[PDB]
Amino acid sequence: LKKHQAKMTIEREPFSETFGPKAQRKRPKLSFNTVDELAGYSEQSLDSYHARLEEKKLL
Amino acid sequence: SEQCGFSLKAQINLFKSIKPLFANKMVFIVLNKMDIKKFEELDPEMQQEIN
Amino acid sequence: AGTINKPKKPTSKRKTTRLRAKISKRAAEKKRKERKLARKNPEWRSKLKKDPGIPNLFPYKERLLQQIEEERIRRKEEL
Amino acid sequence: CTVRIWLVNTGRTEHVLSGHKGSVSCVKWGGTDLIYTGSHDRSVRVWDAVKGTLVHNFTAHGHWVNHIALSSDHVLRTAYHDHTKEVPGTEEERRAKAKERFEKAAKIKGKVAERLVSASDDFTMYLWDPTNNGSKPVARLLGHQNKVNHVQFSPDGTLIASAGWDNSTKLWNARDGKFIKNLRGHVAPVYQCAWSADSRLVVTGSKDCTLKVWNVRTGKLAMDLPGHEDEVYAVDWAADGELVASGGKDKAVRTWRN
Amino acid sequence: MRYIHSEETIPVPENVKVSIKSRLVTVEGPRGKLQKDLSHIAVNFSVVKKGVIGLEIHHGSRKDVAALRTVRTIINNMIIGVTKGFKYKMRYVYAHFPINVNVEKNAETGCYEVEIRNFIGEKIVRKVVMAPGVEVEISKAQKDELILSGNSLEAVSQSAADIQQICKVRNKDIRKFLDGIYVSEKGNIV
Amino acid sequence: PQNEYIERHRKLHGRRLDAEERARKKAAREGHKNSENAQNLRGLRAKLYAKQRHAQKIQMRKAIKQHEERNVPSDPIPSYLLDRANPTTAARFSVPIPKVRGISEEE
Amino acid sequence: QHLARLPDINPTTRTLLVAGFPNVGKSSFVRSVTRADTPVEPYAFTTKSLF
Amino acid sequence: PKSKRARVYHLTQVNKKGREAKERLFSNIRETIPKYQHCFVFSVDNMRNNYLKDVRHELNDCRIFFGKTKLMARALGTTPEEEQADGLHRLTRYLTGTVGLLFTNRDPADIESYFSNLSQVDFARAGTVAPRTVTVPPGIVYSTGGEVPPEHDVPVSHTLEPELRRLGMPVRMIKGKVCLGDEKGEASEGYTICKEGEVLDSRQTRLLKLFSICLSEFKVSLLGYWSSASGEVTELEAGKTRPKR
Amino acid sequence: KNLGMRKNGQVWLPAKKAFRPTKGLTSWELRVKKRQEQAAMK
Amino acid sequence: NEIKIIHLRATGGEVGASSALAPKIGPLGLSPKKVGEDIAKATADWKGLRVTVRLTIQNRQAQVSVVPTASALIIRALKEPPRDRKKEKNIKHNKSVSLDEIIEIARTMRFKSFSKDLKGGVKEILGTAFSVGCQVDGKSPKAISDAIEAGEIDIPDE
RNA sequence: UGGAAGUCGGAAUCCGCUAAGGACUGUGUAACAACUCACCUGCCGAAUGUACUAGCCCUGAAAAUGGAUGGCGCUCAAGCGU
Ligand SMILES: [Mg+2]
What we know:
part of a larger assembly, 10 chains, E: 190 residues, alpha+beta, four-stranded antiparallel β-sheet, three-stranded antiparallel β-sheet, 13 strands, 19% helix, elongated, F: 107 residues, 3 helices, 53% helix, extended, RNA-binding
């Protein structure tokens, strides 16, 4: 499934319909569905970002 | 004054909807356009809700 | 381009004997090869070529068409 | 992008079901008077047939919906016709027998709940119970390595067979959607599958010009059926189980018997 | 094809005097004198009628026949120059740095001179010398407008084009930097 | 600056005062310019220019012919194969190439 | 091109975030306290990107 | 001639009419002739003529033709040998310039009263004499150009500024606004579009139309009508003085 | 005075006539008769 | 004492039409929720349909009326099952309308029509039905219009 | 569609009034507006338009010491066809 996901996404939504002068994309693709999930997602994302920064600084 | 095109109830409901995003942040509700309508001219129920 | 003020090396129009002989030989070989390809040509060719007809700007074209009608009527009457 | 409902006696359109943004590739009509449509706009819709209004809109698939199957298709195709081959005398008795067969085939936990499976070009399948789960799918059936062309419930309601473009036919549990076994004999994409009436065997018709009969309980190739000169497009197994019909690009019908 | 005869005509107003000798054309009006040498073009001049100049070409090709139209318009422009005159109005605009334009008349040469300063804050002084016979004035009716007038249309329009080309923005985005001096109106003095 | 700042600058201040006139005059000079390119460009640049002009002329002819004709699958497949990208699909036991050039051992 | 025209927002500095419904004066407030050229108009969604 | 202007092939829907339109006009006029008692000739000289749509709507029982003058003349017949009805060729002497035919069953005095009472203000075409001096004030240019007061007016749109400069107004863009001189009405005199008594040219009429200033009117002048019962042509006052051919 | 606008702004330019160097070789009536004869022949 | 006429597009049975109205009617002295109220009251007959609404404003209160349009009249005559517009999008008007209803719509739209007669008005309504995508008498509105022009179908006069 | 009125898109693309005018050719607006093109009328005035064919001319690729129609030079030829 991973080896075909990219061509699947391009066949579903071509590049010219996503961004550009003729783009028709209005709804984004989100990893969350509620505001509470968004708050938890932002917290976890900030924690992971700081962890990767600390790992890069240690390296 | 609701001249923005949306009801005060709708604005309050939007604030309550996005309130969980406001954790660990300071929140200030700014009543704009005071030259049109004042907070005292509002009905006491709406003043109570904003309180 | 700056051709007038700074011209480049001229392209000579004086031929060499070697190039003249080679061009003559290639032309003769091309003529022979074209004759062979025409002899083995598989493209369809008409038995009779399409006639252009009479030009429209010829002032007596209608009179010539009348003469053609009269000639074919006389031929049909004789036959 | 529409589905039209026709009255057969008059030939007139009663309802037009619209809302799909792509071609409607498959339609089924269930025993509780609900119409199920699958479409190239990647969605599966449930419509109320009496009112002609949308009931459910499932947008889980990531590509074209190719086929949809109902858990009650086998009894809904044959109505009151059964193994006994004596028909009831009156129309009320015939309708009662048809309804009884549908309810027996669609009963889950003592309640009538039709299950709907949808096969897609995103290599996956979805299992839906709109009566009990609403818009949440029962399961996503995963494991095919290419597009899923055709899908069918077994007549006893325990198994799901699906034919893929990865030259394979897969078997699934019809209650939780868990993969069971892979039927691996075809060398080209498998276009159609058909169940036997006793749910022991499934026949698959493929692009490699052959039919294959599979025993699903042993998971093995029971019979190999060569003879078609070109690709196989249509396969049916008769309800009494006596014959299998295949048709395709070689233009001649073939019937197969024991 | 060679055409046997081709002809154009030029009407001459009542207050104008036209003298043509060996294709050297002199036009006299209330506003002064203009001269133009047309001996690079094969043409026969004549007086067809009272107040009408005839131009003709004999045994000419299509190109030689077509050249008479240019000759006709050139002489008509000299006539219009000595009668009504020619006037080009230019407007200078800027965003931040005001353009300073100063106009002088050189007593030694008789020509006008235009000095342009502070063009997008530059420190250089741009100097353009007008063609002889072209007068430049800073307008009083409108803001930031120069008026170039004269009898010769070519001299006036070339002076305007020299002013236009001296104030050119270089190495900047011209969608953003809009400063310059542009021809805004063309017409007659009278 | 941020977002569409040149568009906002155009909205607030316009363009240069001679912009429309210069654009119209350049578009008017394109015919002479293209002929001058066709007669005066040299070498590989000339060859690529001529080939690309040939492509423009063919495309323009096709568009004009289609506009003239404005006022006027192949093999049967099942519905599940409809709208897919399908191939066009167009004793003496002789091979397609019965004879080729012989290769000597020296080569 | 869009990335080249994106505004530079430092996510770890002192920031005031002006939010709300359309047409309530958000861009008016931002114009009154900063030098940013964010347009003010009476119709909804005058501002379509972050400024 | 290798050097020639390249002809623009238009990729638009509507094609040129040709002789089919001429024959259709002939047949329409000759088929409307026997159904009506009177045929008037009217003239609308140097006018915009978009109010003929409203005239056609009001006279719904009548039939108006506003076509090519020579084609309408040939449709009626200009000689007694070619005339479609008795005495109809005497009407064709009015068919010069911009004219139209009006077939009616109404009493002619009703038509005359209608076109005497029809009054409509209109934008002037080039060649009309200006009735009044029009001057745009200095400062912010408004939509009406000073005809209505600026307090009740709205600023002119910023997309019209290059067109105003092309038509000769020395306007400029100041902060999204079109201004003549400065924003405070300084350093510039007002711009006079036209003076009273001056013959308008098309630049001046285009400026007047852009500022929505009407200096003319729409007026239909009846020249004369032919009657089917009598077979004769009655001349009217405008047709007494208009040139004939 | 001129009532119309010239597109390139050179308002002093005269009302030019069409460049027809073969103008005046045949009359209109003769060309009408030749049109009729050519159509009949075709 | 001046009268101001404002035209707008509204969906029937909705108060959101005043959302875009409130920027301009606010300075005019109107209460936007009040304007939304009488707009919804006037468009309650046209539920779920886009309609044209005229506001006549004098002395700081507005009178609300619905201006009939051919497309709204045809879609109303189609008698579609009620839908919620947020969940049921991309719909098609593929039902059928009788020719008598088409003629009734033409009589309703006669005040806007510039056609000389009712047959011309009916042909206009049939062209609008063709653009909407419906059927007339079970056939194509273009086919009915062609039959009317051929004289097979007779339209009553006035 | 947040907005989308011929002119970001998807699909249809008919009727009236017509002299003629696309369910629009471009510019333009957040959307409108405004402008423009197709098409039509008035003025004007006699010949034109398009596509091909044949000649001659230009381009249709060139390196590296300074040079070659044999050289001068030649242009209603001292070039090309008869
Ligand atoms: Mg706003």
